[PDB]
Design a protein around this ligand. Structure first.
Ligand SMILES: [Cl-]
Ligand SMILES: [Cl-]
Ligand SMILES: [Cl-]
Ligand SMILES: [Cl-]
Ligand SMILES: [Cl-]
Ligand SMILES: [Cl-]
Ligand SMILES: [Cl-]
Ligand SMILES: [Cl-]
Ligand SMILES: [Cl-]
Ligand SMILES: [Cl-]
Ligand SMILES: [Cl-]
Ligand SMILES: [Cl-]
Ligand SMILES: [Cl-]
Ligand SMILES: [Cl-]
Lengths: 281, 281, 282, 282, 282
């Protein structure tokens, strides 16, 4: 595997609490201009989890597993910025205390970090239980590929994604390559370190695949995400992880957290049948 | 049973706490313009339960069993929208921690979800104890009856109501058929998903029945509740569940949460002697 | 002449508010068919909808004719909404229209607005925030010969001009329409008919058997008693009211009615006529 | 003549705000190259940038032409941003320029400013905090013969002067540029195209195949439906918008566009011409 | 003539504040010697200390000459402090001196005040809380032939009058003193040199090898880079600034300096002269 500065990274406690189910209205507004009453984001979601399809749920912006929010507003930036996909998460109060899980993703706006625990643990969790995330990953650098930025990813998880260097190029398995024009909500966020942005496909076939799953690794064509999110640049490529379900409103759909960005000459995405972080929990 | 998208519905944690008895004034104003000092809504109500008469109590808007409110205002909409009659409820703090009950109803305005627990649990409960509702049911669809909307009901409970797809209609057992003109407070609420509305009958005999009980299934003639509450339309029909006691004030009476709505060419209410959710919970 | 009343014993009192902004809790209004529309809603100075115009046909929801008046603060809403009576004198007390006079045409519960008509030339001088004084007068009014007929929400001088006639112990009241109990929705169950309107939920006038319904029209509501709380169904009760705001797109809503009289059908006799509108008297 | 509309049914209503201060959440603006610049940003009376000027070339980020108008308080934001339409009459209601009249040029979401053009002589008299009245008019407009073509955010009188032509059932719209879906960024996903703009994320006009793009220019956005929410990619959809603020230094950002028409390419035919700017009619 | 700049592309924008009261967090000021004194501090209209006077010799601490201007609210502080440039035009917008014009002489971080000179007859009519309009112009200024020399915090018209001379690729700057890195104190570490001053922590002018140091003087700071954050030691860097407030009694504090130029010693050549004070050009 690739040379990194992993040993120089700071490992720090990032605190939050299990978020309630949130809804700003009973209605979700469709792209057809109709309204529907369906579940949305937040909470412990009992029957949707990393590995499941992002499509086909009667729900909007559904977050798999356990949604974690800040204790207060001032604690949001660090929660959303330092938490990396794959980081270890420990429940620190309530009946599941001491149980361990993994960060599967994060979602900007409401600012939730999303966590996979094993099935048995879910029944003992309660909204408000204290959550400790052992944040580790921001600051990571590929020592031999200085023009390839990495972010939002636990360095140990990073090594399990099947990425190979060959001839000063990085080969990255992905389930799908997403055109620039299919990206929507979240473009223009200040930092790709602290939010996801949306693939705005209503159906997976619109991306040319039979399914898109929570946890999938995808490529986003012609987007640089080095600082702010979603700069269109022909020849840019980003790699990301799918983190929340399909949405009903215009401009929204399955969220993606960027883990790698740079130029097509250095990053080579390779389509495979399966590339999903749940295989390496 | 009928074909539903049940396996596509999202099951999510909705939190609250046991609400105190609430009164904005010592007096309740009657429709005769007199004042009475009687108990009202909220709390743990020890001797009024789902299955009891909605009429004959020295009280106003009395909520059977345990009234559950939100931790805070922002959490009211999800509490009231996502909670469905029949959903499993777990006590998460205090002396009855671990005890399980069922949602019987919900009440808009104060925004309480109403919950039945076994008798032995009530004596251990305290105002402020934490409550978890495993919310499940909004989004439910009859796949062979697209113009019949269902809402506010746990899909397992729905299956037990004796509803049958017969002779090209959905037949629904109810204890009474309530004329449009007997509906009052709550008409015009933004969503039928997040509130009840009132049968404004002072006496069960005004509806042509000897009694109306908490938990009863009723039809409301000539009202559509597809989106907002209480649209008069000749030939619409709604089905609902009685959720709180009679009331003393003009335009108020036992509340009804809607569970089904559509046109009389598709829904046939069948008037029977007994149709009450407590028979299944 | 006119019905005997306790009008000299009524207290006349200063009720204060300010011109309300246009209000919207969402860009969208949700229709009874479950679709969304982006349209103007309530509050403000509404420049082109006034008492006398149709309640129907506007691309708007809950449109309030003329000038909407809100309380300075929450504690002041109950008296604003309770004491203000249709026909009461209103005076602008700050801004460029200072000194201009108008009349209360209605009031709308929920947001708690009192609605006011000024002459057209005043409107272009008004600004949201301008202080408003309502010389409130009417609540406590009684028909001394008809103790079982309650009146409310109406300036006693305007009440005398409505063409209401007492004849052989019965009160004849000109109305443009007789609305069945089942056509009433939002507002039923409000704590007091003295402090709110409630909605005729007809999408179209034709649903009420009339070709048009106007802002300012006097209507009967059949089988509703409004003596204390709003909208008690009672077979044989009748209420008389004034239309105060425009039609609505959402389920259970429609042109608002403020009740001015309520009692039994043996005593109140609505007579359906071609015209009955408060704009003719102010 | 002009396309048939429901314009006589539209409600015209007072929408209030105040001149916003210049706003900056940090001294620094972060570039797409990951460096920092200290430059002016949004809000205020901007004395030397106006509708008709280039959107590019300013040492500024998200610069708003003319006078930026904000809500008096949070609850008044939705109506300010939803009901205010490009072209609507604006009147200064306090301070030294009281009585001065201008026009809405645009609006900008997030900070929620409505953007207003006044004549140059006025600008020097304005002060942050001066009360502003927008005679809001236009949401709800419908093309009665083109029900699948949605119009929005535009004063009906201005709409009639834009050079739009109905010929053989198709609507021809002059535009200065046709922008591909993928050049659109910040704002995609906004809840309603009625209450915000969204960004053309081009660092240089040349990235759009044109030499300049001006504040007030009418543009086409290819393959975006904006009927309800903002920025739905759909092949064959077309949207027409007005450029309303300056270029930006950060990733995903750029001159903002307020949508004024959206529908299908079979009905809306954008025609690229040498000039199409609302400043010519204001 | 003048150095080539991007001045035509700079955004000029309304920056609002109000006249600050005199501020004291305690009756006492703590000296470097560990004793306390009761003396006037910052804020207010200071009637007898003005740009051009000595920064030393006052029985006071952190005294701000002329009129101190603060934000209306905290959200407004960053733009007040960032965009306001020394030399910018200032207009009084309420009170008895309404219409009077003055000039920004400086700005002081922490309390976050912008300091302003009006002519003497104006001061007597001013009141704490009077509204103030700063026509902010100058952030974003670039020297187009000297890309590694950064300028900031200065009105481009004032900049052109300071007697700076480009000669053979080098910038000669008249200064009254050259201050070594180690004499700079409070403020080092501030996030941006665009929004704050920092302190020459000399308790006496003689500690800098000069007989006096005046409010308004131009000085060089040796071996400090102020390109981004304040006060980076770097051997060979040079910064130029303006003295903006009086001497101070506490450890680490002293007359404040707003940086106006920063870069390398091979490009910026400070020339120590007898007089170099911005009061000569207002
Ligand atoms: Cl999961
Ligand atoms: Cl590289
Ligand atoms: Cl119960
Ligand atoms: Cl059907
Ligand atoms: Cl009926
Ligand atoms: Cl009117
Ligand atoms: Cl009587
Ligand atoms: Cl009826
Ligand atoms: Cl302008
Ligand atoms: Cl069409
Ligand atoms: Cl495209
Ligand atoms: Cl001075
Ligand atoms: Cl240089
Ligand atoms: Cl030194």
């Amino acid at each position: 595997h690739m040379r990194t500065n992993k040993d120089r990274l700071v490992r720090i406690s990032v605190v939050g609490e299990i978020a309630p189910a949130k809804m700003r209205s009973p209605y979700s507004v469709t792209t057809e201009g109709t309204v529907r009453v369906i579940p949305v984001l937040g909470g412990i979601t009992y029957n949707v989890k990393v590995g499941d399809s992002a499509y086909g749920w009667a729900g909007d912006h559904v977050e798999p597993g356990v949604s974690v929010m800040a204790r207060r507003k001032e604690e949001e930036i660090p929660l959303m910025t330092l938490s990396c996909i794959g980081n270890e998460v420990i429940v620190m109060s309530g009946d599941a205390k001491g149980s361990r899980g993994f960060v599967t993703g994060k979602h900007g706006g409401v600012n939730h970090v999303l966590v996979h625990f094993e099935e048995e643990v879910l029944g003992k969790l309660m909204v408000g239980d204290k959550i400790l995330i052992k944040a580790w990953g921001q600051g990571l650098k590929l020592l031999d590929h200085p023009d390839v930025k990495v972010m939002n990813i636990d360095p140990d998880l990073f090594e399990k994604l099947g990425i190979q260097e060959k001839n000063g190029k990085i080969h990255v398995p992905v389930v799908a390559k997403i055109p620039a024009h299919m990206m929507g909500s979240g473009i223009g966020a200040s930092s790709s370190a602290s939010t996801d942005y949306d693939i705005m496909a209503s159906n997976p076939e619109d991306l040319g695949v039979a399914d898109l799953k929570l946890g999938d690794i995808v490529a986003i064509q012609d987007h640089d995400n080095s600082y702010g999110v979603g700069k269109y640049r022909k020849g840019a490529v980003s790699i990301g992880v799918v983190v929340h379900s399909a949405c009903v409103s215009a401009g929204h759909g399955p969220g993606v957290v960027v883990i790698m960005t740079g130029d097509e000459s250095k990053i080579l995405p390779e389509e495979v049948e399966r590339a999903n972080i749940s295989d390496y929990l």
